[PDB]
Amino acid sequence: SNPYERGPAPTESSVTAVRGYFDTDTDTVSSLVSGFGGGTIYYPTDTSEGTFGGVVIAPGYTASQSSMAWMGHRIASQGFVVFTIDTITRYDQPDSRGRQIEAALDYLVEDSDVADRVDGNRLAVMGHCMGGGGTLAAAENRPELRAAIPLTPWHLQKNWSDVEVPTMIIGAENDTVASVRTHSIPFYESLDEDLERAYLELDGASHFAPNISNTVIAKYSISWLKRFVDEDERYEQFLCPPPDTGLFSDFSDYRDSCPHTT
Ligand SMILES: [Ca+2]
Incomplete structure (x- = not known):
């Protein structure tokens, strides 16, 4: 058996639903926190199936967590602890976002009020725009991460042959930025x-x-x-x-790289 399985067997409708199997609540993290601009943690209230993997989602250039907020309850209700962060400034560059993503991962596992709901050995990174560039940067720096999902990413660094984290890049066909x-x-x-x-x-x-x-x-x-x-x-x-x-x-x-072996 897989000890990390959470929730019932999935269907097309369950995985596409606005809300998954797990009820969720939120916890607010102050910008006073060291290394990033704080944010919101979305987490499952049901502890009976065990701890969940942790996910940090960073926003884009000029943006805040409000641009990523919809992913909070949506992903978290499937069985994840999801931390939609703010950056220190809205105009931080990709590698800075990488380091902030990393500090947020550490905050989530070590310091957060829901640390006892997170399995710190099973973490992932997501991000939009320059945050997606930061996602790659974090993944490149931390090969122990389980997944990385850059969304319409932006970065002057084009080479990521270094990366050992399973990454899903989601691009937008008509992206001009x-x-x-x-x-x-x-x-x-x-x-x-x-x-x-x-x-x-x-x-x-x-x-x-x-x-x-x-x-x-x-x-x-x-x-x-x-x-x-x-x-x-x-x-x-x-x-x-x-x-x-x-x-x-x-x-x-x-x-694709089907089939997926872990
Ligand atoms: Ca494969």
């Missing part, structure tokens, strides 16, 4: 060929698609966290085989 040609795709193609990974390109989507309720982003983010943070093979079904990318699909592109 962090063009997929010059950001997302270079990042993905640089990833090691033996690294479990995925590139998801949303058809007709804008740079700010990750900042609004999106069933596609939610489904695949959830499925990726389940598969690697929880090593949950029950969610393999939503990642493999990969979705269609032809006419009338939500994906303009999809690149």
Whole structure:
């Protein structure tokens, strides 16, 4: 048996739902905290199935946690402790966001009021824009992390052959801020060929698609966290085989490393 499995067997409707199996509540973290700008922790109230994996979500350039807030209850209700952080300033660069993401991971595991609900050996990182660049930076610096999901990422550093964390990059086809040609795709193609990974390109989507309720982003983010943070093979079904990318699909592109071994 897998000791990290949480919640009932998934279905298409359960993984795409606005709220999962687990009721959640929130805890507010002050900006007084050292190393980042604080934020909000979304967590499951039910302790009976054990501790959960932890997830830090960073925002983009000029943005705050309010742009990522919808992912809080949505991911957390599937069985995760999700920490939507603010940065120190709204204009911090990607590598600074990386270090702030790292400090938030440590805060979550060591200092937070819900530390006893987090398994500190099973952590993940997500981020938008420059926060997605920071996601990669954090992943590169901490190979023990279980998953990384950069959302429409931006970073001048194009080479991430170093990264050993299973990463799902979600790009937006029509992104003009962090063009997929010059950001997302270079990042993905640089990833090691033996690294479990995925590139998801949303058809007709804008740079700010990750900042609004999106069933596609939610489904695949959830499925990726389940598969690697929880090593949950029950969610393999939503990642493999990969979705269609032809006419009338939500994906303009999809690149995979199926099957997923952990
Ligand atoms: Ca594989």
